[PDB]
Assembly symmetry: C2
Homo-oligomer: 94 residues x 2
């Protein structure tokens, strides 16, 4: 059984590795097929224990990954894509 102090600390609002579907970040590119179709990004997660607060990113930056992009019957290429990352996260008023 996990100790309360662990549960409490771990579950607390922090940037956590999150698998994000590429379409969420590049919705204009829906007719394309991405390989892989999701990228691992550090995003604000966890809960606050103050009700009136909510976990929100406070320091952002972009990261670049090589992604295969495919257009059915027209082309394919492996190129770089920028994704939004959360370098810092903290609880704040709603």
């Amino acid at each position: 059984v996990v100790k309360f102090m662990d549960v409490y600390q771990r579950s607390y609002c922090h940037p956590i590795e999150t698998l994000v579907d590429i379409f969420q970040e590049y919705p204009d590119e829906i007719e394309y097929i991405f390989k892989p179709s999701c990228v691992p990004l550090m995003r604000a997660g966890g809960c606050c224990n103050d009700e009136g607060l909510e976990c929100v990113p406070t320091e952002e930056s972009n990261i670049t990954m090589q992604i295969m992009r495919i257009k059915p019957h027209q082309g394919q290429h492996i190129g770089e894509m920028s994704f939004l990352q959360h370098n810092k996260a903290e609880c704040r008023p709603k």
Copy 2:
């Protein structure tokens, strides 16, 4: 720049630490109060890069944690709660 192959394998379907709101896990106990309000759980995540496959849990099990809970009109007592975890996850034919 993260290399194509590293991104590809880092996001392919597998159990990944996921912050799960406790209210969600226990639809009944909504009047209850929990702290922390969410727990860190291993859950299937990521993508299959194949239209015929979906990412699903394949070997589950419960994990127990100490949660300071407050059943309305009672005290604020630590308690052991069981949460569903995903030990193994793989792409399986949709």
